[PDB]
Amino acid sequence: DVSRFLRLYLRKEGYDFHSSSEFEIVKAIKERACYLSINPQKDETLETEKAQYYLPDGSTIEIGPSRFRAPELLFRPDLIGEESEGIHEVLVFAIQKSDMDLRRTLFSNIVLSGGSTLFKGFGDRLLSEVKKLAPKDVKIRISAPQERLYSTWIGGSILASLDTFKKMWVSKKEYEEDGARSIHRKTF
Amino acid sequence: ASLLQSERVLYLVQGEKKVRAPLSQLYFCRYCSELRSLECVSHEVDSHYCPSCLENMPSAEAKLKKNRCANCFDCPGCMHTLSTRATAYYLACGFCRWTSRDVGMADKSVASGGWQEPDHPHTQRMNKLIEYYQQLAQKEKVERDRKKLARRRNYMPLAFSQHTKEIKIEPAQAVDEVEPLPEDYYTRPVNLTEVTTLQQRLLQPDFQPICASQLYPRHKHLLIKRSLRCRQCEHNLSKPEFNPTSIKFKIQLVAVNYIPEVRIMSIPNLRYMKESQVLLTLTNPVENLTHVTLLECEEGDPDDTNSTAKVSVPPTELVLAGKDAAAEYDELAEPQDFPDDPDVVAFRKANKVGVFIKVTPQREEGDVTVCFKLKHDFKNLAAPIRPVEEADPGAEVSWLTQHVELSLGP
Amino acid sequence: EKTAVVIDLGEAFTKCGFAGETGPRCIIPSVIKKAGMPKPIKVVQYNINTEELYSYLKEFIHILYFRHLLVNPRDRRVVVIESVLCPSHFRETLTRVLFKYFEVPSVLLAPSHLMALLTLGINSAMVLDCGYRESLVLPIYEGIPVLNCWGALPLGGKALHKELETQLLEQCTVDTGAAKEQSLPSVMGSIPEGVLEDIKVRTCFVSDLTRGLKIQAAKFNIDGNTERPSPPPNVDYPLDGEKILHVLGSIRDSVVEILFEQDNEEKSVATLILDSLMQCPIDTRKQLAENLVIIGGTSMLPGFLHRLLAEIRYLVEKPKYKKTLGTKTFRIHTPPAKANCVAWLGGAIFGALQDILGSRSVSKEYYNQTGRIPDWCSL
Amino acid sequence: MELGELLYNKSEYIETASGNKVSRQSVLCGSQNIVLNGKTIVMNDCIIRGDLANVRVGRHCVVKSRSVIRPPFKKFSKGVAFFPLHIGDHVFIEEDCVVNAAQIGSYVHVGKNCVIGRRCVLKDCCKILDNTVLPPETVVPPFTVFSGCPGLFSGELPECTQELMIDVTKSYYQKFLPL
Ligand SMILES: Nc1ncnc2c1ncn2[C@@H]1O[C@H](COP(=O)(O)OP(=O)(O)O)[C@@H](O)[C@H]1O
Ligand SMILES: Nc1ncnc2c1ncn2[C@@H]1O[C@H](COP(=O)(O)OP(=O)(O)O)[C@@H](O)[C@H]1O
Ligand SMILES: [Zn+2]
Ligand SMILES: [Zn+2]
Ligand SMILES: [Zn+2]
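Above: the input entities. Below: the structure tokens describing the complete assembly.
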């Protein structure tokens, strides 16, 4: 969705990426150059450098203000007009929904996973946006690993290696006899 | 203007926006001391007139008639003013032989009064929509006013008194299936004469018709009489109330009618070296001037400069006699004979002085361009004086520098 | 108060006139004839230096306010119609020209799609805008444009003009008038845009879905022996007087098909409505589908509205759109003014509302103070 | 060339009388009805026919070579006759130009090889560009430029035409001398 919204803002800068192939280079532009400002309103008033990005053909494009106000839509999806909570909100709401005793320990242990946390100054913004929503004088540690993109797989690789995994999985003969539920019931 | 290439040697304007324009196009501002361009100055609207039947129409009548002449018509096929021909009248063009009979408009008994353009097909639906939105906009105004005076009051919506005819337009019905392209278009020769081009289609925008027989002749477009007003200065120039069949200005003001105009009388060789003779005529009756300055070093936008013009000459006092003079009537001593200046000054006729500039061509490949500054004693007369009652010595003392850019043929 | 002027700066043509009128007073090609230049430069050009764009717009607005319209710019307000996602620097420049140079009282930057909706009177409707550069669609639901569910493809005038030029150069048959009665190919390296536009309008038309679907497979030649319908007769078009270009019948009904061609991606002018409508909220589906609006001069092409509405109902049955948009009744609105001048007419209807105009519109006193035009991007 | 008017040396053969210079090469069939009050120039191979005319020309009028000034015939139901044309003061007709115009205004610059139509009125301080066709019974306002095969409003002239055009025609006359 951030890649889709960046394409719209790039057309508002005057660079069209209409083709499905041309959507892939918008994802590359996003991954290369898009920084999350701590205050979005101050960076908008400030005149941008307009940092040049080089395309596959060789042509240059000056991204400018589209760079920072594209990934902002994660933290504030109402701006474009998508009815959602937001990345700062879903984290806090998930902790607040859980029992009162655990809230402090769950705030004290937050782990960032996936590729859409690697945005430059994501941890800086999230910490600030969580703090104001979360209760006052509570310790908030957002422990990002160095391998966020490949964290999900490494977990499976460790889980798979354990002898307990031998019990957890569903055998081919089990699926034929037990039925369809076999996969669902053994999931957890 | 065009015969002699006025679009060669240009004068510079001072302010926010710097522009290089011919002196013929520029205007001198008398309120202050700074010549300004047609671009820099603000434009106004004085009078409307028809280019065929020259009739000065008022501003109010134009708004009703949609900036058009009732009597005159322009042909739709080609863009030219039509003419009434009799047999009992039909409208015909001179350039193309398009008639009013071709499209099938009936001949009128009366000459001008009979002819008319059909009413717009969606004019009734228009007024109904305006009145609906007008009533609906009025509700928003009252809501916005009530909200604003409540904020201004700052009473926190305190209920002192009790709070709280309709116009309903029917929305357009959506057709289930739009009319298909007629089966004629398949297997039929297309004559390009019968169908109309885009240009002549778009001149009639209210119902732009594909066929020529539908395309009616539109009324002739009224033209404008421009009046210029500056940012700092108030008035500048304007036109009479009878601009139709008149070449008179109510207030004549132009850069050529105050600042001394420079012209390249002779053009020498363009092969790396030469000596060019340029004239410096005065327009004012009695004044003084000097082309001393060499446009400094990398100041006053000398980027166009592709040569080193010396013009190492002191001031020369020239005067204009507004009268039909004979060939060498009288020889003045102090003006002409005393500054002989045979190397510098080429010739000195009435309101004329030729000057030799030592240019250095072929510094670039080609297109030789020279920057030089010209000074003149501007009798501004800014202070109140009736037929030069005041001395105007401080005014005459004022030296106005115009950064000229002469461009040699090359 | 005075009747506020309406301007609508487009790549091909600009609409101009006064508020509370049946249609626009002047409609002309958006170009300027500068001294030295043989072909006149286009006034709206995206991705250039601001100073060069400022001079072109200053030159153009001057021609509109004096030669075409006859009225003082400072006296009365402006209603600038411009499409949604119009480049930032261009809109910033256009306002800066009107506010600084001309010193207009107040400009109102209306989106073309929301203005097109007012002309009908209906509060909610889907709006397709087949223009010169890009054919854009934007669902408008009860006054609120839904930017979330936008859609655009480069299948407008420019893409059609380029396709015509390519086809004519392949099957090039001109009678120069110099022993050129015999078919002479590519005597001129390029054809000027003014000619191509006139050929498109007069000669070329939009085919029926049944005939068009055969034309697509015919030129493909997908394991079939001459499976094309019978074309129309060849039309002879004059080029620069003496040179007579014989336009092939195939070119007339094949040039248009690039708009309605699937091209594997499943991205046509037809698909763009259904692609947008499927992405819209579940409650809004049935209201938007029932109220379709087709503006833009590209849709004026003869038999475009029938082909589109037909191509829609065919693409509905396709398995992708069959689930969501299966049992939906697609009905087109017929606007009061012509397809080209629907956008303009909205701004005039809006301009007639003096009370709301002054409030919504950005005053010069605000712009001189701030120097920040409000946009749908963050403030 | 760069504002300054250039030298043009005339031959011995030319009819110089009371300031008015008329090339002997240029026939003017009908010398009775045609009249040249001022210091006019008519270049070689030019035509000024007396087909029931009254061709009055300006103070400093100029007509370049291979150019024709013929009066138009008025298609009147009462009587069909040739309408007498009146060339204004300080009029500059360019080379190879065709003129079938009735009442040409003062201080005008008619371009090269440009055909002006039948019964065509031109008001003072106008300019017709080169390779242009003004159709029959057309009017051109002051401070205007008409061009194209249609012959329609192209733009406006410089404000200072009245003062400027005087210099042009008088300079050309003064500069145009015998060899
Ligand atoms: N270095 C990066 N900076 C910013 N965004 C990135 C970066 N790397 C990946 N992304 C974004 O994250 C996505 C990768 O998501 P991923 O972590 O693979 O998801 P999943 O956990 O479902 O496998 C990319 O498509 C891109 O949009
Ligand atoms: N009346 C018409 N009939 C057929 N085609 C037209 C007509 N008017 C315009 N067109 C074509 O459609 C295009 C419409 O573009 P337009 O909507 O005026 O520009 P923009 O999208 O920049 O506002 C033109 O470029 C032209 O090729
Ligand atoms: Zn001034
Ligand atoms: Zn008239
Ligand atoms: Zn005509």
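Note for the figure: Chain D has one domain: 13-175.
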